[PDB]
Amino acid sequence: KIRIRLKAYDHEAIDASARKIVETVTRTGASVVGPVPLPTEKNVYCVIRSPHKYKDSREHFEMRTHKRLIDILDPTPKTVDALMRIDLPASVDVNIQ
Amino acid sequence: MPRKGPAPKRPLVNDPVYGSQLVTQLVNKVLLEGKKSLAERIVYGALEQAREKTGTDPVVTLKRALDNVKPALEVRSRRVGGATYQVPVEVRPDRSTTLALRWLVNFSRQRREKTMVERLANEILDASNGLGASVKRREDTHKMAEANRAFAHYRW
Amino acid sequence: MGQKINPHGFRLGITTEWKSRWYADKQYKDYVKEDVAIRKLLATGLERAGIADVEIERTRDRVRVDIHTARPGIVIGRRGTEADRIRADLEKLTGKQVQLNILEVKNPESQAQLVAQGVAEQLSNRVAFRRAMRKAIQSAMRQPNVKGIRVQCSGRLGGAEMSRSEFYREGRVPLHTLRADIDYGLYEAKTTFGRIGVKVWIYKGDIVGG
Amino acid sequence: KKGPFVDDHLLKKVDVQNEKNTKQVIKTWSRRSTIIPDFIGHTFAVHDGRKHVPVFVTEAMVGHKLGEFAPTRTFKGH
Amino acid sequence: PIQTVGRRKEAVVRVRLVPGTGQFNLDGRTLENYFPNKVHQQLIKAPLVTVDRVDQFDIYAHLDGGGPSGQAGALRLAIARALILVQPEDRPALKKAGFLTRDPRAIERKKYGLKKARKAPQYSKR
Amino acid sequence: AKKALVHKANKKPKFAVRAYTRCNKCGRPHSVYRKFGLCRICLREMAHAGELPGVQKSSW
RNA sequence: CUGGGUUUGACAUGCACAGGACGCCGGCAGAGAUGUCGGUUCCCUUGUGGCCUGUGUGCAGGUGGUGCAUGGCUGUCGUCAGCUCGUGUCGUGAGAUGUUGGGUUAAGUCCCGCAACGAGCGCAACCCUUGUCUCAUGUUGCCAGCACGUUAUGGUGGGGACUCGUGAGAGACUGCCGGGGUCAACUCGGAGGAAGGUGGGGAUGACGUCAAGUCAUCAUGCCCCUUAUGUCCAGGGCUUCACACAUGCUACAAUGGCCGGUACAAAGGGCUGCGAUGCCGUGAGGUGGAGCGAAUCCUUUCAAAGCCGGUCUCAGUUCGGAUCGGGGUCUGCAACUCGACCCCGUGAAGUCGGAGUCGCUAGUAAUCGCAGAUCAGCAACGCUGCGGUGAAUACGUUCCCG
Ligand SMILES: [Mg+2]
Ligand SMILES: [Mg+2]
Ligand SMILES: [Mg+2]
Ligand SMILES: [Mg+2]
Ligand SMILES: [Mg+2]
């Protein structure tokens, strides 16, 4: 079994690339599992001071990074050139594990 | 919202101990950031010290002192004809009710003593008797206004 | 000129798609180093053929290129002498093979860059700039699939050293709506007395492309 | 905390110098430090940007860099 | 098993109500230990204080997001939502004061061009 | 964007500090990023054109 | 710029007359350039495809100048509600109607009557994130009921039922009712409800204004030079001192400070990097490295305002840290004219700052927070993105500005 977890930046590339990649295994012919996405990698980090006299608009790390985890079955040589051929969104940091 | 008339008004809660509409706005005002328990406890403890000192209801004395600490003018800065005058403006009900409490809160910290209970209690006694620090500080705001009245007809 | 940015880059992330794209881990710099060189070479050589848009993807380090010309027959006169010339030049420049596939667009009158090149050539053709713009608009708006066109020629027109900027529009050309899918083309021409620029916008229709 | 900058450019030179055990001026743009005792016994050429001032060396001299003796300017009062 | 959710602008808490003396089994501590400001302790009980039921029912809440009062209001709305799964008789008594209606006021949008939330640098009238 | 620097940067010298970023598009060494690979303006161009992700220049 | 190279070049190329050595690996003169050196001494084959040394040749290189020749773009009038085109009519005309006029709205979205009938540009319109629900739904992550647990880790079986997870859909359309509305728009209130009347402000900066920053993002004809203004490096400095000034830290203290102890979450990035238990220190740090293309590990199970305890008792002080001598740490071949940091000591203006000026009606301005890339290294406390607690006020556009 080979797992694939593609990420995204602008809240849409995640599915725009999932519905295109996870369907290539079906186009080639094989079974696949449903969607199971992970929220994000957040990793609090806060050490810096500020002017301390005009110090307002309290905000911290507005950002979203979704993950789409789905497995693949029946791995063949023709099933590896599905994503490497083109990466249209430029934000999907896909990793085949 | 701003400069387009008064926005939708927000209600105000009342306390069932004394039953007054001027003993909760002050609480909400003194509820500074992070300080809501100690100040409220001190105010509650001083509300009875004042009742014992003045021998009158904790709210009637304050209602009467609101008029004793009621000013008539407020010094401003209005520039016209190459000169900046201290042209004041007439007092209004709500404006005065707010300014009196603002001055009371600002002068309750004038005394650099440590005892906050005393700082908050002994001031109301003198204010009701006619010698409060707020009553004394309210004199200059009217003196300067009367002095600058020579050019206070522009209604601004 | 105000903030009349190219609208083609506003919906490419919602409705339309990107022209060139690839993936590079610590190699984007070296990849663009050759991409810009290929872009300069094509702008120098193939511009005479009427290139519209060069999509430059990247296979496993060898080649992935696609071009959409407008005059099929001039760039390929005799197989080997003209079609393979650019391939050999690119192979000599960059040490990688090139499986160039020259395909033709559905029509030239529907592309923004092609009509831009046409107007730039008509301007240097010494013909009246106004009549040239009118003819270009009429040719491009012969309802192939389009619904609006907007051309703006600026520079030292009229064979003088002045600075004029005409304006013309047809149909609907909304720029504040995402459901437009407007195509834009940029280019600059050089005459015997100065430089000239042309801003073109072609609105086809309200295709949501969900 | 006696491990400051090693000044390899001068370390190699003083090494090849003590390999022959001579006392000559090391012509190099070394104005960084002379921390290691291997620099003792030999003379170097200070490069402060303008000129150089020779000085004698010995063993009881430990504690500064090679250029902080006299600044790029001169103190004379008038 | 009744289990609801209560969330604020940035907070969210899973709540479950049960019959028992007043106690909030938080993630390792209690209400008096998690809300010592003495104001959040009243804000959270605001819906259960309109019709006194604190000493009659127990709460089990797992909270996250937001700060102290953020989680306080999240658990408040959580209690407001959970009170309907047992007896809707108090639904009007709660809606009259205002509950189960999260304040639509939250963080707005900002980005380059400006530096703070709907705030521009001072410009002197010269 | 000096033709000497644009070559010295991509050159392969025998030192570490002798290497720079020196964006290849034009040669502006200021604000040239790693993942983007372009200077401030060279990146903002394609950003407003929507060529790359993470671009929202809102609030005036 | 102080001085020294190359001065057909440091970086590309079309032709001549000549080559297998250029290219590279080490020392040396060295301030380095650069030159002299050692090694390699071409990959094809007779014709040269690739290489460059110099020799002649046109050329590279201009960061040499003008946003008053241009292409192309922050910030502003302004998110202000207006700006134009086809036909028709009218006057010999610049030209008028449309677009004057009534209402609600931010609005020219609507209509009404009128020589007007239509449309474009903004608005309107669509939608991201947010505000609530349903379908799809289990990993590296949560845990109800079962077990394992013992305290740094649901770490480990099982439940998608719980929200976080996010593709689609319902859901806020003046949609309905009551009063006002030519009985036309529209408005106040009532309802489910998470949001109700352009929920929230946003990408959207419209015909144009100021020849508005920028010939230093880049291209560009004319003007000027090329044994040089091209280019290399050792060093100087754009941070020098008492200043006129500015988005404007540290502070001026009881709504403050000190130390020992002390809970939550919102929540970016990691392949030549974040970097833990524990040993080394009072501290910047050092030998080392589990984990790591990561809901794990790492900024630690992950701060403080506030929070329960001890205290100073209203002062140039135990708040305040600048500067200074000295241990130095840090990344850097290089911390000296010149970066950041802890600590031993000396311990300055300043006691909430006059005339004036400036931000701010809903999670807005303050009171505790954040930094990645821009760097190998730090001015980074100003920026591009950005969490939390949480009040004050509102007679109206007479008044200053647009
Ligand atoms: Mg100028
Ligand atoms: Mg006529
Ligand atoms: Mg130099
Ligand atoms: Mg400068
Ligand atoms: Mg560097």
Instruction: Tell me the CA distances in angstroms from B50 to B29, B119, B120, B126, one per residue in order.
Output: 20, 12, 10, 11
- Chain A adjacent subunits, 3+ CB pairs under 8 A: C, E, F
C99 and C68 belong to one structural domain: yes
Report the residue numbers after which chain F has a gap, meaning the C atom sits over 2.5 angstroms from the next written residue's N, or none: none
* Beta bridge mates, C154: C165, C197
Nucleotide in closest CA–C1' contact with F27: G217
Domains, chain B, ordered by start? 21-148 (1.10.455.10)
Residue F42 assigned to a binding site: yes
Q: Is C156 exposed, middle or buried (0-12, 13-18, 19+ CB in 10 A)?
A: middle
Q: Is residue D23 within 8 Å of residue D54, measured between CB atoms?
A: no
Q: Is A15 exposed, middle or buried (0-12, 13-18, 19+ CB in 10 A)?
A: middle
C119 and C189 belong to one structural domain: yes
C154 and C196 belong to one structural domain: yes
For residue C28, the chain F residues in CB contact (below 8 A) are 35, 37
Q: Which helix (H) or strand (E) holds F11?
A: none
> Rounded distance, CA B41 to CA B30, Å?
12
- What architecture does CATH give domain D1-78? 2-Layer Sandwich (3.30)
Q: How many structural domains is chain C composed of?
A: 2
> Rounded distance, CA B47 to CA B24, Å?
13
The experimental method, as deposited, was cryo-EM
Nucleotide in closest CA–C1' contact with B101: G392
Q: Strands C183-185, C195-203: parallel, antiparallel or unpaired by DSSP?
A: antiparallel
C148 and C78 belong to one structural domain: no
Q: Where are the domains of chain D?
A: 1-78
Identity of the amino acid at C78 = R
* Beta bridge mates, A70: A4
Contact across the interface for A57 and E117, Cβ inside 8 Å: yes
Q: What is the CA radius of gyration of chain A?
A: 18
Residues 6+ apart with CB under 8 A from B128: B54, B61, B62, B64, B65, B68
Q: How many CB atoms lie within 10 A of CB E63?
A: 22
DSSP string for chain B: -TTSSPPPPPP----TTT--TTSSHHHHHH--TT-SSHHHHHHHHHHHHHHHHH-S-TTHHHHHHHHHT--S-----EEETTEEE-------HHHHHHHHHHHHHHHHTTS--S-HHHHHHHHHHHHHHT--HHHHHHHHHHHHHHHHGGG--S--
Q: Choose the mutation target among E107, E112, E119 for the interface with F, i.e. most F CBs under 10 Å.
A: E112
> Rounded distance, CA C58 to CA C201, Å?
29
Q: Give A1-97's CATH code, choosing from 1.10.540.10, 3.30.70.600, 3.40.50.620, 3.40.190.10.
A: 3.30.70.600
Q: Which helix (H) or strand (E) holds A30?
A: none
Q: How many CB atoms lie within 10 A of CB C180?
A: 24
User: Whole domain around residue C126: which residue ranges?
Assistant: 107-209
Give C195's DSSP letter.
E
Q: What is the CATH number of the domain that holds C113?
A: 3.30.1140.32
Nearest to C187 by CA among C117, C133, C115, C129: C117
> Rounded distance, CA A72 to CA A32, Å?
6
Nucleotide in closest CA–C1' contact with E8: G131
Residue C6 lies in a domain: no
C165 and C183 belong to one structural domain: yes
Identity of the amino acid at A17 = S
C119 and C196 belong to one structural domain: yes
SS3 C135: helix
SS3 A92: coil
Q: Count Cα atoms within 13 angstroms, Cβ side, for C127.
A: 14
Q: Is B6 exposed, middle or buried (0-12, 13-18, 19+ CB in 10 A)?
A: exposed
As separate numbers, helices (DSSP H) first and strands (DSSP E) second, chain D gives 1, 2
Q: Where are the domains of chain A?
A: 1-97
Domains, chain F, ordered by start? 1-60 (4.10.830.10)
For residue F51, the chain A residues in CB contact (below 8 A) are 90
Contact across the interface for B34 and E39, Cβ inside 8 Å: no
> Rounded distance, CA E100 to CA E46, Å?
12
Q: What angle do CA E98, E102, E104 make, to 5 degrees?
A: 115
Q: What is the CATH number of the domain that holds C85?
A: 3.30.300.20
SS3 D59: coil
Residues 6+ apart with CB under 8 A from B34: E37
Residue C8 lies in a domain: no
Chain B / chain E CB contacts < 8 angstroms: 8
Q: What angle do CA E11, E15, E21 make, to 5 degrees?
A: 125
Nearest to C148 by CA among C119, C194, C121, C182: C182
- What architecture does CATH give domain E1-126? 2-Layer Sandwich (3.30)
Out of C78, C106, C134, pick the residue that ends a domain. Answer: C106
Distance F20 CA to ligand 5 centre (A): 6
Q: Is C132 exposed, middle or buried (0-12, 13-18, 19+ CB in 10 A)?
A: buried
Resolution number, Å = 3.2
Residue C5 lies in a domain: no
Give E17's DSSP letter.
E
> Rounded distance, CA C156 to CA C158, Å?
7
> Rounded distance, CA B146 to CA B77, Å?
14
